[PDB]
Design an enzyme around this catalytic site. Structure first.
Site, PDB file in Angstrom:
ATOM      1  N   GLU A  82       0.823  -1.208   0.000  1.00  0.00           N
ATOM      2  CA  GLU A  82       0.000   0.000   0.000  1.00  0.00           C
ATOM      3  C   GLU A  82       0.860   1.262   0.000  1.00  0.00           C
ATOM      4  OE1 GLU A  82      -2.664  -0.313   3.319  1.00  0.00           O
ATOM      5  OE2 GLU A  82      -3.702  -2.069   2.509  1.00  0.00           O
ATOM      6  N   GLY A  83       1.939   1.243  -0.778  1.00  0.00           N
ATOM      7  CA  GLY A  83       2.822   2.390  -0.853  1.00  0.00           C
ATOM      8  C   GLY A  83       3.628   2.665   0.394  1.00  0.00           C
ATOM      9  N   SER A 108       0.261  -8.163  29.665  1.00  0.00           N
ATOM     10  CA  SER A 108      -1.021  -8.058  30.344  1.00  0.00           C
ATOM     11  C   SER A 108      -0.885  -7.531  31.767  1.00  0.00           C
ATOM     12  CB  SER A 108      -1.728  -9.415  30.353  1.00  0.00           C
ATOM     13  OG  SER A 108      -0.946 -10.398  31.006  1.00  0.00           O
ATOM     14  N   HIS A 130       7.207  -9.139  42.121  1.00  0.00           N
ATOM     15  CA  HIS A 130       7.521  -7.896  42.811  1.00  0.00           C
ATOM     16  C   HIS A 130       7.472  -8.100  44.317  1.00  0.00           C
ATOM     17  CE1 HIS A 130       3.348  -6.948  44.095  1.00  0.00           C
ATOM     18  NE2 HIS A 130       3.036  -7.635  43.012  1.00  0.00           N
ATOM     19  N   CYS A 141      -0.236 -10.797  39.957  1.00  0.00           N
ATOM     20  CA  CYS A 141       1.245 -10.752  40.125  1.00  0.00           C
ATOM     21  C   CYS A 141       1.727 -11.869  41.027  1.00  0.00           C
ATOM     22  CB  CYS A 141       1.719  -9.433  40.737  1.00  0.00           C
ATOM     23  SG  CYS A 141       1.558  -8.122  39.540  1.00  0.00           S
TER      24      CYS A 141
HETATM   25  C1  LIG Z   1      -0.172  -7.747  39.699  1.00  0.00           C
HETATM   26  O1  LIG Z   1      -0.855  -7.915  40.698  1.00  0.00           O
HETATM   27  C2  LIG Z   1      -0.653  -7.097  38.388  1.00  0.00           C
HETATM   28  C3  LIG Z   1      -0.743  -5.768  38.339  1.00  0.00           C
HETATM   29  C4  LIG Z   1      -0.479  -5.038  39.623  1.00  0.00           C
HETATM   30  O2  LIG Z   1       0.284  -4.143  39.735  1.00  0.00           O
HETATM   31  N1  LIG Z   1      -1.293  -5.512  40.711  1.00  0.00           N
HETATM   32  C5  LIG Z   1      -1.284  -5.006  42.065  1.00  0.00           C
HETATM   33  C6  LIG Z   1      -0.176  -5.107  42.911  1.00  0.00           C
HETATM   34  C7  LIG Z   1      -0.310  -4.600  44.197  1.00  0.00           C
HETATM   35  C8  LIG Z   1      -1.531  -4.022  44.554  1.00  0.00           C
HETATM   36 CL1  LIG Z   1      -1.799  -3.334  46.142  1.00  0.00          CL
HETATM   37  C9  LIG Z   1      -2.604  -3.943  43.706  1.00  0.00           C
HETATM   38  C10 LIG Z   1      -2.468  -4.448  42.434  1.00  0.00           C
END
Ligand SMILES: *C(=O)/C=C\C(=O)Nc1ccc(Cl)cc1
Ligand code: NA
Ligand code: NA
Length: 350
Positions: free
Chosen positions: A178-179, A274, A279, A297
């Site tokens: 498409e160019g 997603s 963490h 998470c």
């Molecule tokens: C993990 O849980 C996915 C996204 C995120 O950041 N969730 C999350 C972590 C900690 C707290 Cl307090 C709420 C949501």
């Protein structure tokens, strides 16, 4: 014999692609003069071969230009002179490719090659054709499009540690449909490092880190609760963060909604587009290793989150098993290895 001249362009030609240099060849003689200028009269850089038989442009030609080529060949039989004029491709739109991982990086055994364009690609096949992937030791791989803009290349199984990978995206002068023509070329090289595979088993609620097949860390974890579970499957480790503000609104989920959230966490390693991370979660240390309590998470202790940050690298692998959730989508952005190889191998260039 009168000398003969042969150019890689035809006089009066239009739509000439600038993905290759322009050459001039002399037969039965030598090139005494060869010049090439654009419509504004500016000369095009070139070089003459030592034997005087071949001339070639040494800089890339531009889009939407009219070039005039003048050449003279001299030989014992006589002389010959030709003047050619041609017009290069006139793109309707331009798209720039962005390649990952970064040049010189050492990545994990799960890292695919990624070529992301800033515009939708109408001729996926043309894009794949313009991407040359070298591997040492050589291995079979294939292209697969996660969406209209990003294509991935990977082998059937995880990379072998120590493999060299070289990626040349030669899209300049290429009609991508498409160019749409490539704005420039890009060229990156990376190497596969240690095998690092972390397995999160929902039956035990332990995240176990294996380095070259040896268990080096066992982390109690709290994964997604039944209403917001963590999907099973293979995750590719992505970016690392000493700390990051988690905002559900970035995923289309308003913060003020039941499943919404906005908080700041430490030592976060991304493993899915997603929004799944490993963490620090000091608020759930008591639940880690027993029950699931997150939005998806892998909640681990502060010391284990930091350890994961320091000892895991882009392209390492996290696999989740035995959760109440589904499987991570293959086109998530870091779920490439969830697509069956036969499907990935057949591709989707249409
Ligand atoms: C993990 O849980 C996915 C996204 C995120 O950041 N969730 C999350 C972590 C900690 C707290 Cl307090 C709420 C949501
Ligand atoms: Na030029
Ligand atoms: Na976020």
């Amino acid at each position: 014999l009168v000398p003969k001249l042969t150019a890689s362009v035809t006089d009066g030609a239009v739509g000439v692609t600038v993905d290759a240099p322009v050459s001039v060849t002399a037969a039965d003689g030598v090139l005494a003069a060869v010049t090439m200028v654009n419509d504004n009269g500016r000369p095009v850089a070139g070089r003459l071969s030592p034997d005087g038989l071949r001339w070639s442009t040494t800089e890339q030609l531009g889009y939407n230009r009219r070039y005039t080529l003048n050449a003279t060949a001299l030989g014992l039989g006589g002389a010959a002179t030709r003047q050619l004029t041609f017009q290069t491709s006139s793109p309707a739109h331009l798209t720039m490719p962005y390649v990952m991982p970064g040049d010189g990086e050492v990545v994990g055994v799960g890292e695919p090659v990624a070529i992301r364009f800033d515009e939708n690609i109408a001729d996926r096949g043309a894009a794949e054709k313009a991407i040359k992937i070298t591997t040492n030791p050589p291995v079979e791989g294939a292209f697969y499009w996660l969406n209209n803009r990003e294509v991935r290349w990977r082998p059937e199984h995880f990379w072998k540690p120590g493999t060299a990978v070289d990626v040349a995206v030669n899209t300049y002068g290429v009609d991508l449909g498409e160019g749409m023509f490539g704005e420039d070329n890009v060229q990156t090289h990376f190497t596969i490092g240690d095998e690092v595979i972390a397995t999160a088993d929902d039956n035990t609620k332990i995240l176990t880190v294996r380095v070259n097949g040896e268990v080096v860390k066992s982390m109690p974890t709290s994964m997604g609760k039944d209403s917001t579970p963590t999907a099973n499957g293979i995750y590719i480790v992505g970016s690392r963060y000493k700390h990051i503000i988690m905002d559900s609104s970035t995923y289309g989920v308003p913060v003020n909604s039941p499943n919404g959230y906005r908080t700041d966490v430490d030592w976060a390693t991304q493993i899915s587009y997603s929004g799944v991370f490993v963490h620090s979660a000091p608020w759930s240390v008591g639940a880690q290793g027993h029950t699931n309590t997150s939005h998806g998470c892998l909640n681990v202790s502060p010391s284990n989150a930091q350890w994961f940050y320091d000892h895991v690298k882009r392209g390492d692998i996290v696999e989740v098993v035995n959760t109440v959730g589904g499987t991570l989508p293959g086109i998530d952005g870091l779920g490439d290895w969830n697509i069956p190889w036969d499907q990935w191998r057949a591709g989707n260039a249409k």
